[PDB]
From Swiss-Prot:
It comes from the Eukaryota. Binds six divalent metal ions. Known to bind copper and cadmium. This is Metallothionein-1B. A divalent metal cation 6 binds at residues 12, 18, 22, 29. Transmembrane segments: none annotated. The keyword Metal-binding applies. Coiled coil: none annotated. Belongs to the metallothionein superfamily. Type 3 family. The chain holds residues 29 to 59 of 59 of the full protein. A divalent metal cation 4 binds at residues 3, 6, 22, 26.
Length: 31
């Protein structure tokens, strides 16, 4: 489940950015 900034805004392209706004692969980050 994506945070309050990943829905229409998954700005994570690599875990280097994903691990910066999130803590894990929301329902949209990498898999
Ligand atoms: Cd997120
Ligand atoms: Cd993320
Ligand atoms: Cd995401």
């Amino acid at each position: 489940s994506p945070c309050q900034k990943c829905t229409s805004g998954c700005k994570c392209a690599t875990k280097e950015e994903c691990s910066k706004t999130c803590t894990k692969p929301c329902s949209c980050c990498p898999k």
